[PDB]
Amino acid sequence: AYEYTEAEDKSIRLGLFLIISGVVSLFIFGFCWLSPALQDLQATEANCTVLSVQQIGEVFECTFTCGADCRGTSQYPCVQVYVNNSESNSRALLHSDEHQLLTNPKCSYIPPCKRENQKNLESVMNWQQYWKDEIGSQPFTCYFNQHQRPDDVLLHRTHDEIVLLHCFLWPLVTFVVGVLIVVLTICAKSLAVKAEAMK
Amino acid sequence: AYEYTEAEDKSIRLGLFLIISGVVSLFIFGFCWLSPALQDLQATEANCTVLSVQQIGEVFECTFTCGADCRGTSQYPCVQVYVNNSESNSRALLHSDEHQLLTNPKCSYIPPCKRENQKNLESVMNWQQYWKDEIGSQPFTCYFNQHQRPDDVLLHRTHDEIVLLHCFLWPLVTFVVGVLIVVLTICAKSLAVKAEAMK
Amino acid sequence: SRGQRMWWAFLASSMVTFFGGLFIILLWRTLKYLWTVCCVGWMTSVKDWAGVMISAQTLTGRVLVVLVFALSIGALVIYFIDSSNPIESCQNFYKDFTLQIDMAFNVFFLLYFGLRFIAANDKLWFWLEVNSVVDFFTVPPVFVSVYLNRSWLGLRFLRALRLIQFSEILQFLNILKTSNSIKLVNLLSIFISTWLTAAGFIHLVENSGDPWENFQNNQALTYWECVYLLMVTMSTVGYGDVYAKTTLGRLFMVFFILGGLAMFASYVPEIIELIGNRKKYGGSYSAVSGRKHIVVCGHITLES
Amino acid sequence: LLSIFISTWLTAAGFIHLVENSGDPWENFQNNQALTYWECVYLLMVTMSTVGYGDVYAKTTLGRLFMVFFILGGLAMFASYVPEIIELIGNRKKYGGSYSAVSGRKHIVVCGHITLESVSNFLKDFLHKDRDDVNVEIVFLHNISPNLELEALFKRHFTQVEFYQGSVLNPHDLARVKIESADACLILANKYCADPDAEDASNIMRVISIKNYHPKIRIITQMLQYHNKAHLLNIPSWNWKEGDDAICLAELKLGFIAQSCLAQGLSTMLANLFSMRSFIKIEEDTWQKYYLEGVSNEMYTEYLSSAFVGLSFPTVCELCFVKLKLLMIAIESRILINPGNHLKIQEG
Ligand SMILES: CCCCCCCC/C=C/CCCCCCCC(=O)O[C@@H](COC(=O)CCCCCCCCCCCCCCC)COP(=O)([O-])OCC[N+](C)(C)C
Ligand SMILES: CCCCCCCC/C=C/CCCCCCCC(=O)O[C@@H](COC(=O)CCCCCCCCCCCCCCC)COP(=O)([O-])OCC[N+](C)(C)C
Ligand SMILES: CC(C)CCC[C@@H](C)[C@H]1CC[C@H]2[C@@H]3CC=C4C[C@@H](O)CC[C@]4(C)[C@H]3CC[C@]12C
Ligand SMILES: CC(C)CCC[C@@H](C)[C@H]1CC[C@H]2[C@@H]3CC=C4C[C@@H](O)CC[C@]4(C)[C@H]3CC[C@]12C
Ligand SMILES: CC(C)CCC[C@@H](C)[C@H]1CC[C@H]2[C@@H]3CC=C4C[C@@H](O)CC[C@]4(C)[C@H]3CC[C@]12C
Ligand SMILES: CC(C)CCC[C@@H](C)[C@H]1CC[C@H]2[C@@H]3CC=C4C[C@@H](O)CC[C@]4(C)[C@H]3CC[C@]12C
Ligand SMILES: *[C@@H]1O[C@H](CO)[C@@H](O)[C@H](O)[C@H]1NC(C)=O
Ligand SMILES: *[C@@H]1O[C@H](CO)[C@@H](O)[C@H](O)[C@H]1NC(C)=O
Ligand SMILES: *[C@@H]1O[C@H](CO)[C@@H](O)[C@H](O)[C@H]1NC(C)=O
Ligand SMILES: *[C@@H]1O[C@H](CO)[C@@H](O)[C@H](O)[C@H]1NC(C)=O
Ligand SMILES: [K+]
Ligand SMILES: [K+]
Ligand SMILES: [K+]
Ligand SMILES: [K+]
């Protein structure tokens, strides 16, 4: 009997499944992980000097939450912080991330929503006072993408560089383990064939 | 003929169905009845002294209803009543129940919504005047749960202790009646077998 | 005299009637088979008279059976009227007309239940028969409603289960003889009664909401919205304009689609098969004056 | 089927619960659609059934991706397994159970070739109003379940006829119909069968089975040839003295023909003497108007008065004809037909 058993056939099927799973997960992560991360790295790490700090008076709505699923909607004032870029050197806005920019593009900082509107206003005033002290000096290591959003300047990138590592790592680990299973099963079968035919 | 008839087989099937129904209803009431009731009893009955009574001016919306399905939305002012706890002894809010807390966390009392905004305001002013008289004295038998909502203090628990009785009673009654049906049918059959074989 | 919800008295009267009579029957069958181990008649004549009256073998049995048909539809219509009412409400018996007509219908059902009890061979098999369980959950609580002068739309939707009897009580009356239309009325009765009963249960559950939120889940549906919900659901269309929102409502809908989808997919094409079987080339030839005709028979195919 | 269905349902609901709560890692987990576990169980039952309300659905990218794979598998799983489960439940034997005898009223077990038309012709000739107030019950016994027309016929005779599905060869089914206390057992034959020796063999086997259970029963049967009737006397319990009659159709049809070879038209008269027919009044003057008056007579059996004892046979036939308007034919003290004037009426 020089043929695979049921366990070796199932093990080859498992190794082939892990090869397919590694390729498919890499194919999935190319559109989910990689492409917005490459759009993030398309934004250039640049310098920026703060131009001015303004308030508008038009308040917006946050959402504070208690323990047992409260949906209290307190309100918070708005501060616009305009900067002077190093690349374009135009009137650009400041933002903490794409998250703050997409929930409210017309402000530069959104506080953690609390119950009291006085506490939200105090969080605004503390952050505004810090950005009112350091004016003109110490140009910031900020980020900018003139091809997509040329009017807004971020403070932190959304995705780390290690995202590019983990997007390519675990599909490759899945591929290697699947290849090792097929190789070890075939090698064990061929050595057992030679060990039985050696007599 | 020493065997069950069709009626006895159907009666054994009914008794087995009531046994299964009692177990399944107990299994259902464990996740529906028991678990939020045990979260209610997790809150500790404590003492609390009233700290202060404030108004904010930010009015909210109630919904008054006429006979033939009116959906009039009158408005009502807000009163925040802050207390001093006995356990944490911090600035905690007052609430009537979890119902008032979840519909509006930023107030201490929501009136029954009427047509006139003047009548809602008068209900607010009467309840506020009662909570403006008794200040400092007579610490209240209130409730508190620092692990989930440590900033709010309730006046009434949502679920009674008799909830724990009815959650375990009627599945047990269903189980007992089902067991009695299977036992009485089997006992009647075995006695009829002995009564026919006695000749 | 509002405020006191006495809904539990109706359901208690139904459960005490069903299970108390069941325990009395089982205790009779233990005591009469302990009496030897430890320690033509006249009742058969009244049994054969009741068995004749339940069938349509006489004239007065035929009148009784037609009354069962008509008053079953009448009691169902009274449920359709009462379904738009609030859940717990009062009604004076001498002023409420529909309560008086419902009284007349249910005292008739009580007498007919007594005839079916006498006519049966096996008292246990009768007490577990499904047409008796309908009487245990409909006939007591209307007497409790007249005693309390207070109504509760409880398990009144089980009045729609009385349409199961229709094919049998038409087989008694020599109306249904051949096998196709016996089967057609059987399929139609089971389909419509299951549809209307399950719509009534989801109507009760969705209106009187979940007891775990202290009844703040009252999705105010009418009865006909639940009938439309179940026809949209059974057909697997599922628009989503109307759906069950409570926990007990979704739980019943899970069990209902497990049963009712197979019921719809099996019964509806079979019903459409049994209707529509019409003979195409029936009728007769009509001769005309001054022109003769020729009849051709034998091996008739396309090429011949 | 139940184990695979429920385990697949609960497992896939748990996976979609994990994926929908801990949201997509690509948005830094801002896709947390906070579903409970039971909402995902309800989601998958709404989805597997192809209802799809849309009140609850997966909103994340991994959630929609699993739902695409789940409907590719789970729709075929639901549509295959659910009607098969409903087939395997609900298979209940309808006409089980046993006959319950009543005091002071005997019953009759009928087996053999039981169809709709044979039972209809039997119940016409048995429950006819031209008999006295009969009170026997008729119990049937056939292994094939009846169709809807036979069930409607049994509902038309709800107090006189009970059906019980079983086989006459199996002695448990003979115990179910109370064959030990039955008054007689009747075995109808399929007179238009394709092989007459085959059904004569089968009905002989039925007589063997009933006599194997209870030998002291009265069996009435139908045979299609005469030699198969001759095999029935070899059975050690077939006692015709108490009433085990074998109605041989070959012997009776050829004898009816031969008696009509002597006097033409006798076979019609004899065959009309046993079909129970009520009087049908014809207003016209046709041949049927006098023929139907001949049809309405049937053969009957009765004891005689004490006042007739000692008289002669032509005397009592003449006087019952002119006073009582009855036609006497034969006598029993044997079963000889039309004795002379020399034989006198015995008492009894
Ligand atoms: C084929 C094999 C490949 C498999 C790939 C496996 C690799 C897995 C991935 C690899 C990398 C992932 C780890 C990196 C985390 C980075 C840290 C971080 O982002 O913190 C975040 C934690 O936010 C949370 O709330 C976490 C809660 C969910 C954690 C559970 C994850 C389960 C993922 C599903 C498991 C499914 C398992 C399925 C198993 C079958 C905080 O971020 P933020 O605060 O919200 O940002 C706010 C934005 N702002 C700053 C502007 C305000
Ligand atoms: C397996 C066998 C087990 C069966 C278990 C049976 C046990 C049944 C249960 C047992 C206990 C239930 C009774 C306790 C009630 C407590 C009193 C109460 O809560 O009052 C409430 C009456 O609110 C209403 O409006 C009532 C209207 C619905 C009543 C009909 C119930 C039918 C339930 C379905 C029947 C289905 C029957 C199905 C039959 C097949 C008022 O509360 P609230 O005003 O709204 O609170 C406001 C909050 N706030 C104070 C902060 C503002
Ligand atoms: C098999 C079961 C469901 C039968 C029904 C039993 C239950 C549902 C019924 C019978 C006894 C009833 C209780 C009787 C007494 C209490 C307190 C009283 O002041 C008002 C009603 C109330 C609050 C009832 C609640 C519902 C109840 C618990
Ligand atoms: C099935 C039949 C034979 C027995 C049914 C039991 C019925 C008749 C009995 C059992 C429970 C009873 C209820 C128990 C307590 C309530 C409240 C009380 O303040 C007055 C009587 C009243 C309103 C009763 C009405 C009648 C009642 C519903
Ligand atoms: C109000 C209700 C509970 C009354 C209950 C009456 C019951 C206990 C009694 C009345 C007459 C009895 C029946 C009398 C004779 C029949 C036929 C017999 O061969 C077996 C027992 C059986 C089937 C009995 C079963 C129990 C029985 C039905
Ligand atoms: C409350 C209930 C019991 C009222 C019924 C009254 C009973 C006792 C009366 C009314 C109808 C009667 C029946 C009328 C005619 C039949 C057929 C006859 O050939 C013998 C007597 C018999 C079988 C009678 C038995 C007794 C009887 C059933
Ligand atoms: C611009 O950015 C770099 C960091 O990338 C910083 O070190 C440097 O000082 C800046 N250059 C000027 C001219 O400001
Ligand atoms: C500031 O902005 C102006 C125009 O907005 C631009 O010309 C100049 O280069 C910037 N200067 C600095 C120091 O960034
Ligand atoms: C605290 O609460 C109890 C009631 O639980 C009350 O009787 C007591 O007076 C309170 N104790 C103090 C020290 O206030
Ligand atoms: C009141 O509150 C303060 C702080 O908020 C706390 O230190 C003190 O214990 C409380 N006193 C009383 C009497 O509750
Ligand atoms: K569908
Ligand atoms: K659909
Ligand atoms: K859909
Ligand atoms: K939909």
Author numbering:
A (entry chain F), B (entry chain E): 2007 to 2205
C (entry chain A): 16 to 54, 91 to 355
D (entry chain B): 238 to 569, 577 to 592
What does the paper say about this structure?
The final protein sample of Slo1 co-expressed with the β4 subunit contained both the α subunit and the β4 subunit confirmed by SDS-PAGE and mass spectrometry. Structures of human Slo1 in four distinct states were determined: Ca2+-free and Ca2+-bound α subunit alone as well as Ca2+-free and Ca2+-bound α-β4 complex at resolutions of 4.0 Å, 3.8 Å, 3.5 Å and 3.2 Å, respectively. Due to its highest resolution, the atomic model of the Ca2+-bound α-β4 complex is used for most of the structural description and analysis in this manuscript. The protein sample contained high concentrations of Ca2+ and Mg2+ (10 mM each). Four of the β4 subunits bind to the human Slo1 tetramer, extending the channel extracellularly by about 40 Å when viewed from the side. Consistent with disulfide crosslinking data in the literature, β4 subunits are located between voltage sensor domains (VSDs) and each β4 subunit contacts two neighboring VSDs simultaneously. The 120-amino acid linker between the two TMs (TM1 and TM2) of β4 forms a well-ordered structure on the extracellular side (termed ‘EC domain’ throughout the manuscript). Four EC domains form a ‘crown’ on top of the Slo1 channel. In our Slo1-β4 structure, β4 associates with the α subunit almost exclusively through the two TM helices.
Because both Ca2+ and membrane voltage gate Slo1, it serves as a hub in numerous physiological processes that couple membrane excitability to Ca2+ signaling events such as muscle contraction, audition, hormone secretion, and neurotransmitter release. Slo1 functions as a tetramer of the pore-forming α subunit, which is encoded by a single gene, Slowpoke (KCNMA1). In this study we present the structures of a mammalian (human) Slo1 channel consisting of the α subunit alone and in complex with the brain-enriched β4 subunit.
